[PDB]
Design an enzyme around this catalytic site. Sequence first.
Site, PDB file in Angstrom:
ATOM      1  N   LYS A  57     -35.570  72.311 -93.931  1.00 33.39           N
ATOM      2  CA  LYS A  57     -36.046  73.574 -93.379  1.00 33.39           C
ATOM      3  C   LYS A  57     -34.764  74.589 -93.066  1.00 33.39           C
ATOM      4  N   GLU A 106     -35.281  74.617 -80.871  1.00 31.14           N
ATOM      5  CA  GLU A 106     -34.380  73.758 -81.915  1.00 31.14           C
ATOM      6  C   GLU A 106     -32.939  73.296 -81.192  1.00 31.14           C
ATOM      7  N   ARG A 107     -32.352  72.244 -81.877  1.00 34.70           N
ATOM      8  CA  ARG A 107     -31.224  71.613 -81.299  1.00 34.70           C
ATOM      9  C   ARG A 107     -30.298  72.783 -81.161  1.00 34.70           C
TER      10      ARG A 107
END
EC number: 7.1.2.2
Lengths: 188, 508, 47, 469
Positions: free
Chosen positions: D154, D180-181
């Site tokens: 993704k 997200e990270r």
Amino acid sequence: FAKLVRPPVQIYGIEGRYATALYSAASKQNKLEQVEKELLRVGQILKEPKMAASLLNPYVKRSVKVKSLSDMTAKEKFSPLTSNLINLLAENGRLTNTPAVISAFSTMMSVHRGEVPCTVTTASALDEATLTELKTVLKSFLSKGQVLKLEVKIDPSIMGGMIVRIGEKYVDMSAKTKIQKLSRAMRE
Amino acid sequence: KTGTAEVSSILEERILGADTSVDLEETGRVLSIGDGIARVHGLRNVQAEEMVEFSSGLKGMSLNLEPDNVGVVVFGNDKLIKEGDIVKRTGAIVDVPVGEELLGRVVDALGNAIDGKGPIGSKARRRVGLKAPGIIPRISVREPMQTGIKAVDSLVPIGRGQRELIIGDRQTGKTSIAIDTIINQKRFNDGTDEKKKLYCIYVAIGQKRSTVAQLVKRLTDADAMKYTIVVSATASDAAPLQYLAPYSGCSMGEYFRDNGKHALIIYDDLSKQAVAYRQMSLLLRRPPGREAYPGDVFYLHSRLLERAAKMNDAFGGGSLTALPVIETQAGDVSAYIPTNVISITDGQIFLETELFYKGIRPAINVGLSVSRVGSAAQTRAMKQVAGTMKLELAQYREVAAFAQFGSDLDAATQQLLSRGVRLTELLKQGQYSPMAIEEQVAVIYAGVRGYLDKLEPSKITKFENAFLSHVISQHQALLGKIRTDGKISEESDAKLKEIVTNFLAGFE
Amino acid sequence: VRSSAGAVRDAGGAFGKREQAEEERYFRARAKEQLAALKKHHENEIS
Amino acid sequence: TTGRIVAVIGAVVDVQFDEGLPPILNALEVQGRETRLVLEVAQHLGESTVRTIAMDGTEGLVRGQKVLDSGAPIRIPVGPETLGRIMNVIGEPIDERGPIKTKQFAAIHAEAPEFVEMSVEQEILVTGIKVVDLLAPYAKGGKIGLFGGAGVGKTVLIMELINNVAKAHGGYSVFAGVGERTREGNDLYHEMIESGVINLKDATSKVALVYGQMNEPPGARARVALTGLTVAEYFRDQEGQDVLLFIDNIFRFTQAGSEVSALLGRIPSAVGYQPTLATDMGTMQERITTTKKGSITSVQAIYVPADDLTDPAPATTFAHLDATTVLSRAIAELGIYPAVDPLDSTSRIMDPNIVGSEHYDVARGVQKILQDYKSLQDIIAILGMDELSEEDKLTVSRARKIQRFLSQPFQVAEVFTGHLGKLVPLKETIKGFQQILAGEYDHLPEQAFYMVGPIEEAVAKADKLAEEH
């Protein structure tokens, strides 16, 4: 909604909500002292064994309970505030926790007139002179106009010294805690 | 214990005798507001499901009448509603406008135009929560509802007054079935036969606005809006509007049913109305059941779908076909809402993704599709050809496993495989290209009499097309005879034989 | 509950790996043969 | 107005007001914090209390702390000055570069466009990716989804799209990283600085970034999507221009909504999700649209928990998207990258009247051959390849060639594969697949087609394979 005036000390629960409603109602129209006296009166009025037995039975209809309480209030010539409060507690079926409401309002009014409950714990009793200087110093802790409400319990579990609670403030000059502190720090 | 009206504000009001200047019979004060649910104090004379109106111009439906308070569901964002607001009765249960003034108009769940074409005529109003007909008014389903799709009209017939069910997975063709059904009715509406005209209603629950705009463009392109209503309850709409939109559509269609006309209502998608109702019920603290759905969720869909009836001539003879759409997740027709609505309706058009990509579009999976009405909803000619087609397809489905091997098997199995492949290639259809019943019967008649056992399967889709154009251009008398007559007379059978042979005699 | 095409390799059990290998070995062999033929054609078409 | 914290439970703060209450969705500022803690009102509980979700850590809050009522929802800075910057949910910058000096502040909560504003025009957006362009072609102004579990591609695919479309796109662009990270946020910041879309010297930046990464409390993750959406909406309307809007992932918005619902007093729904899942997602996805005043091309990465495409979150998200590209782990194990599933991806414009009859027929032929291959794989598990009809082996060979030919090397996946990125024009992809189906390559080995651009590169790779044979 009506901007109710908040009580000094927030009591919580069913009794808290009823008592805060009563306090807000009384604070406007300025009937706090009279309504507190009437609450103390109903504290005994309902406590009568006949009335208590007739109000703790949930099989007498709320209609009969409200009618009896209206008759008692009329026979006692109460303020409309206290009569309406009793009617409201009766309609909602909250009579079993009426003494809780009176206790809550007592706690709420005590803080209104500036009182800070205090507790003193010692191994043994005290000489009245020492208690007098304790009164003086503790009044030193308080602010202006804040009367003190001293309570002197005697706990022999502690090995000596003194323990003082002033509101949420706490000072522990007791032998037991210092023994514990030394034993622990020394054990390390 | 505790009540929600025992807040210290109400008790304060009541202690000092301030509860007599407030009219707690037709007005109320919001106690709580959150996640689209308001809890209102007062409104003692408010009826269940009545519409109340908040001070800030919003509306709401009063669903939960409890001893202390009223649980109202707000028809919009609860940004504008604040604790302490004033809520006034409207006095009337929710109702919507109805009439021919809606045709060609896009409306929302409450009958307000949202296409910016001007006010809505609206001579008459109708309550959305009206009981369906009874045992007696109805009569058996006899007339056909021409879908224009070869598979649906041949093997899964849909009558008028029937509740079919386009059940399938995501992106399989359900909305395409619905739109082809809507578009195929132009050949009847344009004509003059007043008992064949079908008026269409498209309820769009929970779809994004771009999808509905593209759909309306598609209908307008096909000139199929002049007899279509579109009722939008898109995703941004509050849960109560998504919950009501099927009922608004059903009442706008019950109007046509009650007046002798015929209507088609396509609840697309019902599995989203169920979700909206689930939201409303969970936020009203109602006891959940399986999958968190309320207990009365079968009731919600049954009282909606049981309004699709075929009234008798003593009531007008009108009808309201229903085509609810449900999206199963993997293939699970045993889930909760799929189960409920499969047990409520009268059949099902079961769509596949294995068939969609194998080239069989529309992906109607026969064998799982069914119509408990059946031949009663077919014309005589369609009956004649479809009986044989269905029998042959059933024979083909039980030896389709060998299709790979095929050879090294008896001649009977070879013939079954060949005929089945030809028939399946015949049931393939384009998109937005419905076909009159005469066209369908001609094509299937050519197919099921062996006149394609010589053509290669890859060429059947080209045959069908060329042959159909041929008959439609050269031979109109035969098609008109079949159409008006309704059956295949012996002379018409001979004419079809000669036409099929002559066209197939040289095809190349 | 039904069954669908391409399910043996969706489970990934023993039959899935067995089928994957039965396919890969055969197509490696055919790729080798086709590469040999491609080399031969390359050499034979230089002139 | 001034109120007073009365409870703190996790990320949910109950604030009591003595004066008039603040309306739902308003922003309140806690007084006595070194940093800026903003609560957002979510409910009115009666008795003058309002429940709120904190947009920051609620550590060190004291029952009684005073709170100010801003009077409006969270208002973020918007304009051309936000380009090249980074922002929180509440709009303050986190790039350590100074204040964002705009004249316009936009509230992050707004109504979705009405039905009389929808554009109904679709034209293919050529991304340069073979599988996407062939089977699930995108569309200008349409909403794209990238489903798939964890570790399927993704983020790599979305970075690849930013590399292609955004770099050569005249209009502006917005990237809202939702839950997200943070490593990936920094990597993107530096990659963009290197490419040049973010220019730290001039005022020529073409990308505005908003970050709500997964170290933030649920309140901030549930709203950073709305912040990025507000920036994009402003660029759509006032600038009156094309916009791109990348989100990664839009499942963390739902999940963050689910982490506070139980504490707000709502009974849960099907699988530990909030009862308002569909409504909460709709009220957001309905502002990401191409009205008649502007045009937002929205690319969304959607985590699918445990590869389960029937989970309520992805299942609901499916209905809000024009195009979907369902990345599949079963295909990423095979080494086919991007792992886009050709049979589980769809597009709205994928009709013969929008793309053309050649494109449509090639796509449908590819899908049909792959489905037939899947049908055959069951038989090969028992017979074996040696026992198939000499026609079936042809289907299997074509299917494997087509399966490999959909793989492509990205310019951002140089580190993994070591190969070089290829951009394949649409006509070349159509030609390649039409030829592979027509049989014009049934002699080249399968591996020749693996990770190459146009078909001629496959021919050249086969030639090299033969020479060093």
